[PDB]
Amino acid sequence: IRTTKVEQVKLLSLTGTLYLTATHLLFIDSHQKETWILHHHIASVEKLALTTSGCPLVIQCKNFRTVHFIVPRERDCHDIYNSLLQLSKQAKYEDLYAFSYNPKQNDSERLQGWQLIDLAEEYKRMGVPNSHWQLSDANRDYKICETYPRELYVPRIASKPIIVGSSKFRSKGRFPVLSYYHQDKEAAICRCSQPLSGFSARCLEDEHLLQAISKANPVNRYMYVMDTRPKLNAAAGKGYENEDNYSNIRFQFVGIENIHVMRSSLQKLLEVNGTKGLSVNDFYSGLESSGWLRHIKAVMDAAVFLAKAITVENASVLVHCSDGWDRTSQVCSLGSLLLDSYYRTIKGFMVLIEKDWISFGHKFSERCGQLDGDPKEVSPVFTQFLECVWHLTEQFPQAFEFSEAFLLQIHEHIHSCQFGNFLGNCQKEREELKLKEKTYSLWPFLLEDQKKYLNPLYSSEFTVLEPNTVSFNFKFWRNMYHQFDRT
């Protein structure tokens, strides 16, 4: 579309033609002076009442430049206005399914859907708080950490100033906090981010906090720390606690590559799976050339280690790696699933995700692409977790209440955004987006169709699962790969 005799108003206002494409709105002056306005630069666009000299169209740009045009005919202006609105629309959460999806729930039924999972009852299920552990108001208003829940559990020995200090020495402020307590063995699973152990940076409160966790364990005074090496493969620190300054720690390599290597691996997987005109030999060659199986295999190994450190040689473990939200979330969860029967329940698996990913800020919006954020901040970290829980159902066909159907359906709604549960990257924004009042919860939806997901071969009711890994047993999940491309 093209409009002639248009005026770009200026009190210091020449006439020209105004062109409109899908890329930009271009104004060519009577002389030749071209003014370009890329649609993705428009902040706002108004259209004031028609005057004796034309229809005014004001455009506000993202660099604070306001442009004023006079389009001769209202008809022409009206088409430019309506198409500038369509072409200047930016990525929003309110555009997602969850905000429009309404299954005739008279609001009261919706509020009860969010109150279904109460983590204050999950921690109380594990006997927390007790004399060893307590709750801290440290995040009551998201003060100490942003990507952490409002309610946090720390040792009853460790006090308020110890917490404030540690958070300042840990990446993103994700300080050592209780991820799971074992009532019977009195051992703990703690989660955090890497410490900023730059050159010879020392933080007393952090040293004292790790000391508090070991001292909270009345059976083993030796603690474990899970991370990546050689030379850390995940600026102000090599992210390792200095063993000379933390004289009560043991280190173990997880060997699990970063989110960029995960996304890359999956590309070659879906690139092999998605393609046809292949051979059985060539398909699996390319399938293993992706090293995707090697990735999930090394994920499980970290869970197998963490469970063995709690079960065999009773000792509290600290999982952090780097940012403590991707691989730390994977291990903390998979580990806790191997040692607790309740998390193998349908409702127990919902409370597990709700705690370890939803409340403890997993970046779903960033890793799953809920908006138009960074392509590099996108990886299948919760897909890898579910594939690990699948291998466990294939390993132990009686230990889990649910089957392959429950996992695939959880994997469906994360990629569908029908429910406001995995919307955002942390619990602070989830509350800011008013999801508990604007959307609907997935968990009570699956708590209706239980029958289909239910494993009939399941043993009604308390031991620790021992999954094996020898490269051979680990094999491809065809029903997973099918969800990305249905061919």
Next chain:
Amino acid sequence: IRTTKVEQVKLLSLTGTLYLTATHLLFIDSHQKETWILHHHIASVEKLALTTSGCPLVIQCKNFRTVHFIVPRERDCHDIYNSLLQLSKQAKYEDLYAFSYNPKQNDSERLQGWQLIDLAEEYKRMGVPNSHWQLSDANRDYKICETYPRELYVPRIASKPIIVGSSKFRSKGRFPVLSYYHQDKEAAICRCSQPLSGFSARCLEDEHLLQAISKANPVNRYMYVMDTRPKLNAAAGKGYENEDNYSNIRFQFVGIENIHVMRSSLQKLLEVNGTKGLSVNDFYSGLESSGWLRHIKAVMDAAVFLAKAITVENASVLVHCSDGWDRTSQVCSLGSLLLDSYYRTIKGFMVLIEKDWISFGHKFSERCGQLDGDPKEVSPVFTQFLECVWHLTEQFPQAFEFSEAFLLQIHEHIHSCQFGNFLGNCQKEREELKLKEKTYSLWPFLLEDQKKYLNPLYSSEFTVLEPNTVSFNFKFWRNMYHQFDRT
């Protein structure tokens, strides 16, 4: 637009209606199952040849999910394909004016336009390298720093391993480097980013590098460091060199607020300027309530300080603040302009911007909004600089070769992207975007219309300018504010 009897292909493929809006492409199943595809989620969209059973339309999403549709009529499919292409277009540099603008230059004339400004001749103009300073291949392949030029100048005393170490202790790797040398006084202006002085983190190579700069000064062994306080107003460090570990340093507060306070200030300025139906009293009340004048006043003060430390008490200065690209760029430039006559030349002012902002990675694409990046990463930091150079022309109407016209025209093409000079955030991407082969240079364009920009009241040819500041002398730039809104 709405298409009936559409098939969403699945080998595990039901029929339904396919709706298309400006926000999303929605598929409603025969049952009720809705599948949402937000246009800003589409990566690719192909349309293979028409079959006896319909026109196949494959959509690849940003979460690696591939969707396959069969639209009954090719006509209907063709309209959906063409509109999905228009609605899935993402922000690109190639969309900007500079890539399309072609003023009939037979390419040879374009290559000579980039070779116009040679910084290897600017540093050689200042007698660098000499026995005190030298060039380092440390960034020959952008190894040591990303937001820094390929060519860097460091003391001839300081060696290659000293540089590698310092870069690891400085934020973004922006280590102490020569920003300007004073041949006659033998004093230096050095630029860097804040050090990561976390808790008690010490870096020997950094301590030795600052020592090398003072030792390179044969007149004063005392050095200066310019930054922000109280408690730093700009995680792993309070960004201050520890004076007990750098026992040859003096600190001075710049008092210049961060980019968020700059952008906010300008909003209230343009909000007052842009509005009408006011009063003379109310306009300036709101104009000063923005505190924009207080901002440019405190910017100049830092330049006035830096020039006084070089001129009065001969001593090398280190400007860094935090990231050393916004306020550090402002001060390093404004300061060097006050003490050197050559930068007050029309060509000399071009080489000044080329060095201090273009080569030393100022974030033009981020602060000016060249794409659709973060709204919070947008501030008028180079606009504030030009407003300071204006107050200097108003202060000294004979000291500068150019006038108000040259500044406003430089301010025009930064917001016009007609020339590939301020495209990007650093010199590494400028080379990656192949700007020297795909676009055209601004500097030789202004080196044609010199006549209009030229100050006729200018003194043909070597002292240091003394600008005064007492709140009163500083007053509003109406011709600046007019460029944002021409009312």
